[PDB]
Design a protein around this ligand. Structure first.
Ligand SMILES: NC(=O)C[C@H](N)C(=O)O
Ligand SMILES: NC(=O)C[C@H](N)C(=O)O
Ligand SMILES: NC(=O)C[C@H](N)C(=O)O
Ligand SMILES: NC(=O)C[C@H](N)C(=O)O
Ligand SMILES: [Cl-]
Ligand SMILES: [Cl-]
Ligand SMILES: [Cl-]
Ligand SMILES: [Cl-]
Ligand SMILES: [Cl-]
Ligand SMILES: [Cl-]
Ligand SMILES: [Cl-]
Ligand SMILES: [Cl-]
Ligand SMILES: [Cl-]
Ligand SMILES: [Cl-]
Lengths: 311, 305, 324, 325
């Protein structure tokens, strides 16, 4: 019989398991729930909350066959993405899930997403940080909350799911992530000021100038299509002035799906390929927190570290 | 036999047509031709005034446009055109008409044919066999022929062996003389909510007099409750800045921030919200009238409660 | 979809006909699940059929049995949930739409891909949603609830044998979608009568279902004509195309001349049927096989001449087809 | 595979008929369309069939005609596009996959929902893409190209009679998707032999296609047992269920007794049969389409094999048409 650790970090799902007979069925793994203190709305999470969860998995790693992280949907994809970088040589499944309706409210999805995450962690283990939602397991660092009001809340726009649940559970033929074998390594992080700039008609040089001020180590650009911005010379020079001061400037697509393929490149900007804002932001927290020079971080942002981008 | 006007504004498309089932059409090549990534809000104005000049002498309008900001233009034209009595269809291509496997020919042919034969008196975006309400569109798929989505509204029309109008609820629609609303430059900020965002971002925009702030918030419109954040946002509204709360999510409806003077943008796209703000800021309306108008369905861009 | 008052506590009748949901006791499982008993949920009464059936073993007589059950309890409840096996859920939902006229209360067919007894069951959530919908969104048609969508019954088929999304409505959007909120879609209404519920009964009808496939001969239509048939459904290619060889077209004209109702459908999941006409074949527009088979059982069970049935097959009686 | 672009390829186009051409009209239309003659496009040769056929009128003999045409021209060209009516495109693609052993060159079936000669035709783009894919992405399978996707032929059905997205592959992802770039998908390969192309004959075989539906009688299986059956395809419910009626199960057991190959499929668009009918001699068709199962039976019944060998072969993945357990 497998044993699954459940980190109950907060979220809708919690806003009871004993009174439901399905959970204690013989076919289920054993599981234990740790209720965090305090419980958090995932809208209130900081990057240090990613650290608390990573260290909680680290404490429990040896004594469980897998890990379920119960979490608010608002930032679930950021947490999943962060854990993927912070965990290295992961040898057990870590599945983040939650609910769009609280377990306490009628028609809650919370019971069914938790039961599925527990069953899948035990019986179809995949040694990656994954996100289970509405009968699909996704690579955590490929996810976004796409549908604010839907039970199918999460998408994986640039990658098929890893696993689908119907009458049976099927592992899909999705290409595996680069995967280290060895001792689990858990990478701590420390606060990093990062700006997120959306490219839109009538954006000014002033925005890039503002972030440069004193307080930012990296800039994420949400640019058009395959990575275009207006060719405004003030804008470009601001971006060059950013990279000249060692700021890591990364070009993403504002589009739900697709790949940046770039100039901005002349202005020191690094392409983020098909990375989500969630993967890019967390990967920056990860790399900035390490003993790495600006140029090594700039190189690593465009490489596939944990399956978050297509080379 | 219908006559369709084609504004060739630029874009990928330019970097069977004359056979008898087709409408007559005329192409106006803009000077200069523009990559849509280079568009400013004054380019929306130039297109609206071009449609105004040609309105009386054509049965419909096709706007040829780069894909990068097609949804922004479509969205802007929907506000700027009032009491529209003929179809305005924005389209283009993911591959240049000049490159192999181009979608340009089939998107243009379709847009001309639909403008002539299935007119809908709205600013629409035709792409990959679907017609969408312009102010509901986003470029969702950077690399795909199905480049555009309408996440919170079904398409108005779909083309197969036959073309059918779908049963999509009609937009609020004025009858009367076409009114074309000019716009003038408006400084507007777009803030994405994410873990570890600082009050300084809102402090920065408050100090470089922006007239409006769009928040891309979590889920149904949540942000972290950090008192410094909420305070800077309140300071912005105190100074008369229009702060509108949208979902960063592809689909759904926004539902403390309110206490801080922030307005709910319901299920509006960033494209709709930004262009609506250009439109309303450009008219001579109180901040309070602008704040109430942002949450009202002016042209079919949002789903009322 | 009407948004019905929640003011008073509703009473829903549950016809537990059989199906996966109750296999391994249903009533005891539901007694033990607190969500079913909350103040926001309607009161409900379960009639367990004797015997319980695997929906694979259902005959038209079972359609008749369920319609009589609804008629018997119609004045006494606010709505009806038919718990049913998935395998023929779409044929039952299609048959009820034709057999019930002047329907002034919801009838919702639902079930599960996995038994309530088994692990990872969809039965709890499909039945909870059906009950809640029947109470609060009382659409006066026979509908099918599965996987957070309410569908027009006579537009459904089981499209996904292994999926929790088992049912599709290929030629009509859903009536309603469930998320954080329950959203009514603006799908236009079916024809509606007025007054007390009328059940149009059925009696056995021999009906053949021919698939058109390359190498099918005129001896197939001759074989169906050979003893047991009053109607032939053709699952034709694309928009209603069949071999145009004279033997095949003669065989069909001979069938129609003997008063066999021949109906041309697409074998395709979606689309609309647009020679065969001159051979007496009637176009079934965008109808499913489930809608067409059940419509024929309804129409053939009435004292109608062949011409009247032919005409009625191409007409939208209950929302099952899209008129030109 | 992403094939080399170094030498100008030569693609043979079998113009069998279909919506695309509705003599000399196709070939003249393509002459007049500059897209087709650019440097980046392969050279191509059109063989226009006489007569051209509506795909609705196709029989197994037509599958054989097309297979002989490919074999006759195999060494002379780098690849084959089969231009075909949509109505039975999926039956032809499925039949070729079984008939063509040691296939070392792409064969791509395509066509159009709207004639090249009409307005808003999809024929231009489906055929241009097919040619360009055959030359540059030379997958050694019978494939079907429609609406920017390349599918495994023996996994397809015409799902959408009115849509430009007419074809689906309900149980297998596409092999390739076309956008700004051409993306190859992770889809695992079919079994492949080695050496010269071998064409297995497919002949006429009396095969019945039974839809299971409430009220179906034993008389249907008795009817088919009259003559037109060496094989019977059951379109059963869900994961392969049928009524438990003793007479029904008797007639099926009787058929398998008389050497009739009885194969159980789902009537559902997607999913997999899971097998009683097994005790009645019925063979499970796993997740095969009717198109793959009809053509597989034509193939095996026309081969030098006994009833037992055909029954075993029907549940085996021969060409990528079936997902093994
Ligand atoms: N999660 C995401 O990154 C989706 C999209 N690329 C965006 O810019 O929001
Ligand atoms: N077009 C859009 O607005 C999509 C999504 N709401 C975003 O914030 O990018
Ligand atoms: N339910 C259906 O009718 C689907 C499809 N038209 C078929 O012939 O099976
Ligand atoms: N192509 C197919 O076989 C689809 C579906 N299984 C049918 O029975 O028609
Ligand atoms: Cl949503
Ligand atoms: Cl690793
Ligand atoms: Cl102007
Ligand atoms: Cl894309
Ligand atoms: Cl208006
Ligand atoms: Cl109630
Ligand atoms: Cl070539
Ligand atoms: Cl269709
Ligand atoms: Cl050899
Ligand atoms: Cl399935």
């Amino acid at each position: 019989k497998k044993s699954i650790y459940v980190a109950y970090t907060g979220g809708t799902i919690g806003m009871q398991l004993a009174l439901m007979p399905e959970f204690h069925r013989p076919e289920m793994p054993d599981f234990t729930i740790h209720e965090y203190t305090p419980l958090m709305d995932s809208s209130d999470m900081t990057p240090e909350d990613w650290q608390h969860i990573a260290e909680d998995i680290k404490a429990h790693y040896d004594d469980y066959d897998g890990f379920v992280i119960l979490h608010g949907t608002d930032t679930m994809a950021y947490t999943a993405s962060a854990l993927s970088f912070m965990l290295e040589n992961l040898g057990k499944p870590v599945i983040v899930t939650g609910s769009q309706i609280p377990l306490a409210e009628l028609r809650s999805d919370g019971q069914i997403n938790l039961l599925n995450a527990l069953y899948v962690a035990a019986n179809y283990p995949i040694n990656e940080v994954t996100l289970f939602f509405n009968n699909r397991l996704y690579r955590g660092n490929r996810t976004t909350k796409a549908h604010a009001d839907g039970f199918d809340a999460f998408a994986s726009p640039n990658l098929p799911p890893l696993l689908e649940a119907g009458i049976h559970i099927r592992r899909l033929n999705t290409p595996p992530a680069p995967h280290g074998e060895g001792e689990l390594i858990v990478h701590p992080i420390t606060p990093q000021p990062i700006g997120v700039v959306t490219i839109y008609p009538g954006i000014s040089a002033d925005v890039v100038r503002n972030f440069l001020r004193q307080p930012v180590k990296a800039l994420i650009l949400r640019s058009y299509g395959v990575g275009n911005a207006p060719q405004n010379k003030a804008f470009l020079q601001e971006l060059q002035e950013a990279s000249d001061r060692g700021i890591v400037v990364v070009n993403l697509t504002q589009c739900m799906s697709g790949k940046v393929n770039m100039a901005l490149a002349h202005a020191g900007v690094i392409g983020g390929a098909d990375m989500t804002v969630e993967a890019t932001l967390t990967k920056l927290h990860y790399l900035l927190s390490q003993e790495l020079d600006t140029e090594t971080i700039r190189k690593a942002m465009s490489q596939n570290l944990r399956g978050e981008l297509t080379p």
